[model samples]
Target chain A: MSNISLIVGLGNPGSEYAQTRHNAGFWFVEQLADKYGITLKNDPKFHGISGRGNIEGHDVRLLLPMTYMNRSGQSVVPFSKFYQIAPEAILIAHDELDMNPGVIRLKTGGGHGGHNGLRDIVPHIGPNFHRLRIGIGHPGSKERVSGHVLGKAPSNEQSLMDGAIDHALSKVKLLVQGQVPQAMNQINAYKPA
Target chain B: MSNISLIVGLGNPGSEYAQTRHNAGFWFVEQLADKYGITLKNDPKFHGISGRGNIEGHDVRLLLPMTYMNRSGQSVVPFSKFYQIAPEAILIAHDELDMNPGVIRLKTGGGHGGHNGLRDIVPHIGPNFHRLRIGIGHPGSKERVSGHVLGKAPSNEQSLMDGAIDHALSKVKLLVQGQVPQAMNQINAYKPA
Candidate 1:
C-alpha cells in the first residue's frame, strides 16, 4: 500500500490565471474538494487553500498553493513539514505541456521535465512523490509555450480537460487506498470519446 | 522537419509469443503494413521482416525484428546501417508496462526504463530515436510482470489495444510529415470512451 496523505494542486492565485492552461491543477483540486465534500479555505501558514477530509475511509489533506506556479515549494514544503508527510505519501497534480487536453497520466518519481511548478517543488520535497499530470496541449513552438500556458483555453478544450479531471477523480479512491498501480492502470488507459 | 525513415516493432518470433502482450509492437507493424499496402517479407540480411512504402508522401521502411525482444538491436542495427537511417529518423514501437492497454504515448530520446527490447537497441543506436510506447498495463507485482507480458490478454483488453493502435495509425500522416509536436498533442490526448 502506497498511501498518499497530501494531494497538492499547483497553480497561480489570481483571477488572471484562473482559467488558463496552467491552472488545470487548481481546477482538479477544486473539483476534488467538491466531490469529497471538503471545504477549502485560505491558510496563511500553509500559504494556500488547505482542506482536510475523509476520502474512501482514509483521511486526506488537499492543498492548492497560492505561492504561484514558480514558488509552489514555499507552500508545499511548509505544509508537508508541519504534517510530517513524507514525499512518498504526497501527490502533485499540475498541467503538462507534453500532452494535449483530455489526457492525464500518473507517474511516480522523476525529474521536472521543464515544468516550472514541478521544478520549484522538487528541491523542497524531492522527486519521490506521485504526479497526476494534467494535459493542457502544446503551443507548437518553444517561443509560444509561456503564452500558451498562461493563456485561456477554448471552451471545447476546457471541456475535454474537465473530462480528464473527472476521469482522474473517478480513480481517487484507489489512490487514497494506496492502490496506486491499480489506479494508474485504469486512469492512464482512459481515452475520451 | 524531423523525418522518420525507419520504424521497428520489437517482439519475439514464432507462434508462441504471437498473441501475447509482448507482441503488441508486432501487431502494430502488421496492421500498418496492411493499411499502407506494404508487404513485409522475411529478410535474412536485415534479420527481420522488412517492408518499404510511401506514407504521406514520405518514404518509410518498417521492420519487425526476427532477432526477438531481448536481441532487437541485432535486426535493427543491420537494417539501419544498410539504409543509412540515422537514429534521429528511427521510431521504435514496443509494449509499455507503465500504462494500461488502451493508452499509448509518443516521446523522443529517453532511456529504456527497464524495457529489454529498448535496452538492447540503445547500446547500438543510442537513445535519440522516437518511441511509440504502446501500453500493455502492469501485472501488479514485479514477480508477475514477466508472466503477464508473456501471457495473452482477455478479449476486452485486446479490443482496447486494437483501438489504441488505430488511433496511432490515424496520426501517422502527421508523424510522416515531420509534424511531431502536432502529432504528439493529438495522439497523447486520446482517451477511449
Candidate 2:
C-alpha cells in the first residue's frame, strides 16, 4: 500500500525567485529541508524542487514547482494523480494578495482570491486541498499592487515574509501530519514572535 | 507540457551502505553532486538518496534508491511512473561484472547480465532506458566472485569507479542530449590516463 502525503510548495525556479514574495513556498521548504541537511537543486523530471523526509514518523514529500505562477496546475494536478493522494492531501504554500503584509493564513476549498498561482492550482487539485497563504499584503496604492505582488518584495515587505516563514516553520510539521486546520490555527494571523 | 524524468541511484539506506560496491550508483551521483556542492541525505518519501539539480539545461533529478541492489525498483518504478518518463530517460548507474574493473560503459535494452541490481531495475523501467554501467571486473573464482561483486572493492576497483565517475561527469551533458551512441563509442571503453 502506498501512503504518500505530498506538500506542494509553489514557486518559480532560479536564485532570483528565492526570497521573493512569490517564492514564499520555496523559501519555506528550503528552511525545512535544511533542518535535515537537505537542499533544493532542481528536479528536471518534475521541473521542481523535491525533498522527502520523515515527518511525525510518516514519510512526506515536499515539492516546490519551478514553473511560473499561472501554470501551477501543470505541476500539482499531475503530482496528485500519480501519488494517488486526494486533493485534500496536497497543500500549497504561496503568497496571497488580499491579506495584509506580515499575516499568514490557512484555508481549504476557497476561491483563488485573485492570485493567479492559486487560481491555476485549485482548478487542477480541486478547491479541496489546503493553501498555506503567506501574505505580501497590498501595496499602499491599488495602482502599484499588481506590480508589487509580481515584483520582488521591497525590504520591508521582504522582512514581513521572512517573519511569516519563521511562523510557517513551526506549523510545517503540522501540515505534514495532515492537520491542516490545526496547522492553520497554529500559524494563521501569526505575528513576529 | 510535462517532461518529468525520474533518475534513481540504486543503493541501500544508511551509513553502512555508503561507499560499498553495492552503492556504486549512489557514489557516482554523489560525486557528481559534490561538483555542485549538493548532498544526499535520506529522503523517506522517495525511499532513496535523492536530490534535484538542473543538468544539461534540463531540469534533471538525481536519485539513488535506498532499497539495496536486489529491490531497487521500489523507488524506480513508482518514481518513473509518477514522472511519466519510461525507461527511455531513466538512467540507472550500477556496478557491472563483465568488463575489467573501473571501465565505464553506456548501453541500452540489454539483458541484466546476471546482475541482481540490473535485474531489479529491468522489470520496473521496462527496457527502454539508458544505463551507465560502471564495470567491476569478475575475479575468477565463482565463490570469490559473489563476495567480490557484493563486497567492497579492493582499493584498485575503488579507484576505477572513481576514475569512471570523472569520465561520466564530462559526458553528463552529452548523455542528456541523447548522444548515447557517441558517448558509448568514446569513453565507454577508454583506459584511464
Top lDDT: which candidate number? 1
Residues A1-193, candidate 2: write the lDDT tens digits.
Answer: 2222777777765443454566777777777777655555666566566777776677777787765566677667776677677877776778777776688887877888877778887776678777778777776775555345435667887787788878788777677666666777888758753
Interface RMSD of 2: 23.9
**Residue pairs in candidate 1 whose N, alpha carbon or C atoms collide under 3 angstroms:** A191-B191, A191-B192, A192-B191
Per-candidate clashes come to 3, 11
Task: List TM-score per model, in order.
Answer: 0.50, 0.47
Q: For residues A29-128, what per-residue lDDT tens digits would candidate 1 score against the true structure?
A: 9999999999999898987999999999999999998876777898999999999999999999999999989999999999999998899889888899
Error (Å) of candidate 2 at residue B6 is: 3.9
The 10-residue segment of model 2 chain A with minimum total lDDT is A142-151
lDDT of 1 by residue, B42-75 (tens): 8988778999998879899999998657768989
